[PDB]
RNA sequence: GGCCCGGGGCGGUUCGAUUCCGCCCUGGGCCAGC
């Protein structure tokens, strides 16, 4: 029930078992031969090449080295030809440039084209930098592979493992740099508790300093921040997570939490107890990749949240969920209904010119003075949050992300009441309201 | 696609807008993809 005790039990959940390892080995061997028969110049990279992959995430990464002088077109075409001839099954994928994904003797494989270069400068795509990251990591991580797995298991279990937009957490590469720096999972965790939003971790200089933002400098390029996409709040959840684990080590820190679903009836009662306005904007999920979609759901959610606050509906928090089918932007406000009348600030009494224009507007109520300036009573076009967002979304669809906005323009609706509790959003709502138990 | 910085045009709203809500062109930086 002590740190060392728990970590020994944790390796069991993070380290791949013999069969998963053997399987991976037989795929590597078979893949090596198929490539050598074609006399292809390649290099194995990633967590599989450095035996640092988390149990259950076996995936082999093969990068095809190409002469610096080739056109990007050659790399894709020849790269496609090679992946095609060497994979049991294939499928083109797309990052900054297209590549090939597939299977070999049961395991997931990525056949990626890149330039074989000496010295990081002259890098044309992120994929060119990968081989360099690999060379730097291969000699320094050796011997600490399980410290990397324990760290990965910890972040994954707690929903902040990857660096893609759906997570905004800690990439694999970042985890290995963290181990090379701190020496182990426990040391990483012990020190992370002292991290601030101004921390700068420079692996190459073996230094830690104060910067303007959380910055983990890439050993292979000092101008690159490896944790660039680690969100501020995620950085915060990690720090607090380390403080907790060191205070009461548990195996539950490496185990994914059960969705702990709640019956909608109880949900309704809680929204009743809160006396707030809870609603969602439902529309169709545009057919695009998570990496383009989630940042859009974030913008759309934010723009609307801001509309709600300047409109005085006192928004508490927002959320959002995607599905195969639709997208939901969730909201909770403190004001279910606001009066129709509100007060507008006018000019100071001395301003005769502007006071006159301020009174020229025929209004239903006749303005008044207070503290030296005129004020007017005006009437709102809407008096409820839902009613406000129907207006906002209908006319400001274009500011909600290129795709999400285009979809909301062609269709959207606002759900509330029971009708909401029946949509695939009860989990997001529970996280958004702090529902506990 | 999203984020940061900067140019040139507009619409709306307001007593009053560079200053709030937004739309066109447009220069550079960065992020995810592995």
From Swiss-Prot:
One of its GO terms (biological process) is tRNA 3'-terminal CCA addition. GO terms for molecular function: ATP binding; CCA tRNA nucleotidyltransferase activity; CCACCA tRNA nucleotidyltransferase activity; magnesium ion binding; tRNA binding. ATP binds at residues 47, 50, 133, 152, 161. Keywords: ATP-binding, Magnesium, Metal-binding, Nucleotide-binding, Nucleotidyltransferase, RNA repair, RNA-binding, Transferase, tRNA processing. Its cofactor is Mg(2+). This is CCA-adding enzyme. It is an enzyme of class 2 (transferase). Belongs to the tRNA nucleotidyltransferase/poly(A) polymerase family. Archaeal CCA-adding enzyme subfamily. Signal peptide: none annotated. CTP binds at residues 47, 50, 133, 152, 161. It comes from Archaeoglobus fulgidus (strain ATCC 49558 / DSM 4304 / JCM 9628 / NBRC 100126 / VC-16). A single active site specifically recognizes both ATP and CTP and is responsible for their addition. In contrast to the eubacterial homologs, the specificity of the nucleotide-binding pocket is determined by both the enzyme and the tRNA. Mg(2+) binds at residues 59, 61, 110. Homodimer. The keyword Acetylation does not apply. The keyword Ribosomal protein does not apply. Catalyzes the addition and repair of the essential 3'-terminal CCA sequence in tRNAs without using a nucleic acid template. Adds these three nucleotides in the order of C, C, and A to the tRNA nucleotide-73, using CTP and ATP as substrates and producing inorganic pyrophosphate. tRNA 3'-terminal CCA addition is required both for tRNA processing and repair. Also involved in tRNA surveillance by mediating tandem CCA addition to generate a CCACCA at the 3' terminus of unstable tRNAs. While stable tRNAs receive only 3'-terminal CCA, unstable tRNAs are marked with CCACCA and rapidly degraded. Changing residue 50 to A: High decrease in both AMP and CMP incorporation. SUPFAM superfamilies: Nucleotidyltransferase (SSF81301), PAP/Archaeal CCA-adding enzyme, C-terminal domain (SSF55003), PAP/OAS1 substrate-binding domain (SSF81631). Its EC number is 2.7.7.72. It catalyses: a tRNA precursor + 2 CTP + ATP = a tRNA with a 3' CCA end + 3 diphosphate; a tRNA with a 3' CCA end + 2 CTP + ATP = a tRNA with a 3' CCACCA end + 3 diphosphate. InterPro entries: CAA_C (IPR048833), CCA-adding_arc (IPR008229), CCA_tRNA_nucleotrans_2 (IPR042090), NT_2-5OAS_ClassI-CCAase (IPR006116), NT_sf (IPR043519), NuclTrfase_I-like_C (IPR011068), Polymerase_NTP_transf_dom (IPR002934), tRNA_NucTransf2 (IPR015329). It holds the Pfam family tRNA_NucTransf2.
